[PDB]
Design a protein around this ligand. Structure first.
Ligand SMILES: Nc1nc2c(ncn2[C@@H]2O[C@H](COP(=O)(O)OP(=O)(O)OP(=O)(O)O)[C@@H](O)[C@H]2O)c(=O)[nH]1
Ligand SMILES: Nc1nc2c(ncn2[C@@H]2O[C@H](COP(=O)(O)OP(=O)(O)O)[C@@H](O)[C@H]2O)c(=O)[nH]1
Ligand SMILES: COc1ccc(N(C)c2nc(Cl)nc3ccsc23)cc1
Ligand SMILES: [Ca+2]
Ligand SMILES: [Mg+2]
Lengths: 418, 67, 440
């Protein structure tokens, strides 16, 4: 067993966390009580990656729930599958300010969360590491989530830290301090995670509005996309296949330089094998509001789920690379790897999930950089933060580090083999 | 000729011994510097995480001074 | 006596070991429980098959083998599989954390925690040998375990067993079935570290095996199991001389004398024929001349390269089945006239021939047709260096930008280990150029 410990934090973190556990429990045949009423056993062969086994054949997600507000905890327990989680793994406090989540309010509660992390970790035969779901635009998931990463990283410096980070969009939330909170979190993520899935609320909205034609898409509409993606990118962690994937092998093969670890996920359909491939590389199927043809792919992981000719998948993946060869860096040979799993996600006979490390991700960070400096060069709203003891230099530094990430992404987009 | 015969077999023994000796010393030196280097990298990683705790304490201190 | 101990390392090595030992059992009449009814030597004997199998008092024939992996997944399937009773549990060794496709973890971080145990188990096998000849080491170039742990083991074996013979079966990476983008790094690191510790190494190019399954067995998308059944046939041809008696049998070590002109030039090209489906072998018997001819068709090589644009330093033919020297000599004579076989000027041009009469076996439910006669050719050709050139180029594209190097440095490796390894490979490619130049 190679256990992952899952952590969800803040408003957004706990919502997408529950849906992920709903979707993969359904795919592995676990009901809200934790019992296995499953058809195939491929579901149980690697089930220990994400589930603790309990007496009476109960499966408890290795999941820890955290928030500085007690409300969203209650909805989780009331929500579908709320009884499957272990009740001790709920940690709750009693405000959309990163500083409060990271330095003052969140610090007050972080020691209590680590106690729960330790308990689940000490029962592990061989811990892979952690995956954190959170938004970067609020206060708890953003500020306290990144504090938790630092504290966990200090205690498990040889484990992999992976996050699913939800980037803010004005198209979804009007809270003005989102660009500050996002920039401060990114500053933490660049230094202290090994892999981050950029789950962009702008792209999720744009998919719902344009592709899915929803005039006013809800957080429920957005998260349906998120659950499909999270199911896809975890496929090779959860099922037996030609590759024994784990979080470390994902990092090693996707991250050519430590800081360039922010992935564009893609999903299709939002079909024929050529079409799945064609759509999956399409900008309209990306969960990060970036156009890949505005950059170059350092590495790509592709997962095909369902029943299909793997010969045809092989040819189509070779085909898309040959026809789009300019958008894959030539100094990393064979930088696209494909995996195939027989079980499709719920409701689909065939799906394709895409994980790209693309220099076009700089567009996402550029967008946040604009909203950030629009306020900071006015020194606007700093008092919410300097009032907590923060220094102007800290905002300049977090801004400067995220500026550096875009330059570095631009540096390797322009590099050539000869 | 007898003298030359045992010098040949002594030479064969000496080369085989020297090869064994250098392989043993080569990996002993390799594992030693590998262990140092990995530890230096982990030590630097903790030293910067600890600086994050020093900075977080200072942040709360400055908040108190603001009262 | 003259025992051989096999060591299977990492996923590729373990799974190929499964195919090989299954095939050996079928070839020798050994049941999955290890009983061999035709062996009247109960608990012992100095028979030819005893180089690869020891015997218990209870009549069980046990592979002289150790399986090592840094994670339990692949070896667990051996522990619960069809041939579980064949192996003593101590022969199957597993850690808990694999190398995560990282040579530095296989060689140092994870590998160093289990190396002493592995050498203890190997030592227990050696101590049961009255005449140990050497080791056969199976592994991938590309895996973190196959590369890093294997080279650590080869270093320790040179220390613990002097210059006792060490042979390799090495899986060269191919994009069609590879698992990691850093396989070129792991390949160059392990080739460099292992070069001095190996006497003879058989490279198996996964793309060549993948093509043969697609072209000649009509397999649309070959799996590891398809590749390994073919690979085990080649491994069986090479080891057949060690495992069977025969008047015309020629020992593998006698072919080695011819295959290895300088210590570093020790990578023979293997070519195997016939590989044919049951549907096509029907009412179609391949003669000695036809299967011999097929050994000079590049599409049948274990490593993609073009011997027609290189030079030969040796050429060996290993036949099994219904073959007599007269047919072989006739087939060679016509081939010499009709083919592009250029030898370097400093070595003789004759072909060394071995014949074992036991005909090839096929695993039930496989894809290979059962044939009356087969041949594996082993040639020392300068052409095999092309495979080094392709890998060194892939290594160079990534290393110039230092792509992924931080994963190795983070495990304690230094940049100088990469450049030292790449320089040795450059000097190897140059060695192969120099042996092909005419004398003065
Ligand atoms: N022919 C053949 N090749 C294999 C097989 N399994 C893996 N390989 C090759 O081995 C390479 C990767 O090395 P692996 O052996 O799988 O990795 P490992 O030895 O388990 O080491 P780790 O990375 O730590 O897991 C790939 O490029 C594959 O082509 C197999 O069963 N048959
Ligand atoms: N895509 C998406 N974004 C969300 C969701 N919930 C919150 N956000 C974003 O997160 C930011 C506010 O963070 P918040 O959820 O309030 O953090 P918390 O209250 O501390 O848990 C806003 O900019 C939102 O855009 C969600 O369900 N989906
Ligand atoms: C660029 O080359 C590679 C990219 C990724 C990987 N690994 C480890 C993967 N890990 C997971 Cl979890 N899923 C997938 C799906 C397709 S590949 C893959 C390996 C090589
Ligand atoms: Ca016997
Ligand atoms: Mg492995």
């Amino acid at each position: 067993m190679r256990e992952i410990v899952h952590i969800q934090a803040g408003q957004c973190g706990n919502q997408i966390g529950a849906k992920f556990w709903e979707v993969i429990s359904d795919e592995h045949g676990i009901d809200p009580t934790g019992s296995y009423h499953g058809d195939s056993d491929l579901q149980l062969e690697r089930i220990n990656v994400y589930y603790n086994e309990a007496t009476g054949n109960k499966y408890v997600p290795r999941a820890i729930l955290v928030d500085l507000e007690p409300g969203t905890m209650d909805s989780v327990r009331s929500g579908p599958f709320g009884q499957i989680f272990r009740p001790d793994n709920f940690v709750f406090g009693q405000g959309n300010n990163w500083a409060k989540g990271h330095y003052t309010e969140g610090a007050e509660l972080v020691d209590s969360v680590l106690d729960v992390v330790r308990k689940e970790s000490e029962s592990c035969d061989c811990l892979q590491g952690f995956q954190l779901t959170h938004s970067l635009g609020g206060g708890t998931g953003s500020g306290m989530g990144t504090l938790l990463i630092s504290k966990i990283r200090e205690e498990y410096p040889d484990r992999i830290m992976n996050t699913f980070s939800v980037m803010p969009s004005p198209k979804v939330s009007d809270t003005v301090v989102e660009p500050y909170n996002a920039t401060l979190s990114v500053h933490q993520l660049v230094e202290n995670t090994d892999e981050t899935y950029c789950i962009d609320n702008e792209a999720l909205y744009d998919i719902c509005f344009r592709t899915l034609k929803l005039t006013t898409p809800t957080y429920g509409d957005l998260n349906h996309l998120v659950s499909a993606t999270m199911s896809g990118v975890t496929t090779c962690l959860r099922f037996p296949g030609q590759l024994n994937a784990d979080l470390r092998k994902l990092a090693v093969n996707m991250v050519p330089f430590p800081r360039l670890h922010f992935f564009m996920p893609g999903f299709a359909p939002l079909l024929t094998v050529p079409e799945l491939t064609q759509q999956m590389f399409d900008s309209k199927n990306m969960m990060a509001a970036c156009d890949p043809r505005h950059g170059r792919y350092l590495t790509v992981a592709a997962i095909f789920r369902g029943r299909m000719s793997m010969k045809e998948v092989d040819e189509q993946m070779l085909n898309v690379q040959n026809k789009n060869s300019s958008y894959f860096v030539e100094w990393i040979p064979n930088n696209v790897k494909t995996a195939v799993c027989d079980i499709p996600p719920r409701g689909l006979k065939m799906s394709a999930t895409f994980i790209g490390n693309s220099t076009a991700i700089q567009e996402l960070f550029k967008r946040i950089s604009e909203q950030f400096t629009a306020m900071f060069r006015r020194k606007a709203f700093l008092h919410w933060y300097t009032g907590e003891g923060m220094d102007e230099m800290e905002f300049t530094e977090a801004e400067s580090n995220m500026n550096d990430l875009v330059s570095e992404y631009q540096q390797y987009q322009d590099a050539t083999a000869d | 000729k007898r003298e030359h015969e045992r010098e040949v077999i002594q030479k064969a023994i000496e080369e085989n011994n020297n090869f064994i000796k250098m392989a043993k010393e080569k990996l002993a030196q390799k594992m030693e510097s590998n262990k140092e280097n990995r530890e230096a990298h982990l030590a630097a990683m903790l030293e910067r995480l600890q600086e994050k705790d020093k900075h977080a304490e200072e942040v709360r201190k400055n908040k108190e001074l603001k009262e | 006596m003259r025992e051989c101990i096999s060591i299977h390392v990492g996923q590729a090595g373990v799974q190929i070991g499964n195919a090989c030992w299954e095939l050996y059992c079928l070839e020798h009449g050994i049941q999955p429980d290890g009983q061999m009814p035709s062996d009247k030597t109960i608990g012992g004997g100095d028979d030819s098959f005893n180089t690869f199998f020891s015997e218990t008092g209870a009549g069980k024939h046990v592979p002289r083998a150790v399986f090592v992996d840094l994670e339990p997944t692949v070896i667990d399937e051996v522990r619960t599989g069809t041939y579980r009773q064949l192996f003593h549990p101590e022969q199957l060794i597993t850690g808990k954390e694999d190398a995560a496709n990282n040579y530095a973890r296989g060689h140092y971080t994870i590998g160093k925690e289990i190396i002493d145990l592995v050498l203890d188990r190997i030592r227990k096998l050696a101590d049961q040998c009255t005449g140990l000849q050497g080791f056969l080491v199976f592994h991938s170039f590309g895996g973190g375990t196959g590369s890093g742990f294997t080279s650590l083991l080869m270093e320790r074996l040179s220390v613990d067993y002097g210059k006792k013979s060490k042979l390799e079966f090495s899986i060269y990476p191919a994009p069609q079935v590879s698992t990691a983008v850093v396989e070129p790094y792991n390949s160059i690191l392990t080739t460099h570290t292992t070069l001095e510790h190996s006497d003879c190494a058989f490279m198996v190019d996964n793309e060549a095996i993948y093509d043969i399954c697609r072209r000649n067995l009509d397999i649309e998308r070959p799996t590891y199991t398809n590749l390994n059944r073919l690979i085990s046939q080649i491994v069986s041809s090479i080891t057949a001389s060690l495992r069977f008696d025969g008047a015309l049998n020629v020992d593998l070590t006698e072919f080695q004398t011819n295959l290895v002109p300088y210590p570093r030039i020790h990578f023979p090209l293997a070519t195997y024929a016939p590989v044919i489906s049951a549907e096509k072998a029907y009412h179609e018997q391949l003669s000695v001349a036809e299967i011999t001819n097929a050994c000079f068709e590049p599409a049948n090589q274990m490593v993609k390269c073009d011997p027609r644009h290189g030079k030969y330093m040796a050429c060996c033919l290993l036949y099994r089945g219904d073959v007599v020297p007269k047919d072989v000599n006739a087939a060679i004579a016509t081939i010499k006239t009709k083919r592009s076989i250029q030898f370097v000027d400093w070595c003789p041009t004759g072909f060394k021939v071995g014949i074992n009469y036991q005909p090839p076996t096929v695993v039930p439910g496989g894809d290979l047709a059962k044939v009356q006669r087969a041949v594996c050719m082993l040639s020392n050709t300068t052409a095999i260096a092309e495979a080094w050139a392709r890998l060194d180029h892939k290594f160079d594209l990534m290393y110039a930008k230092r792509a992924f190097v931080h994963w190795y440095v983070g495990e304690g490796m230094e940049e100088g280990e990469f450049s030292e390894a790449r320089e040795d490979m450059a000097a190897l490619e140059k060695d192969y150029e120099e042996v092909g130049v005419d004398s003065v």
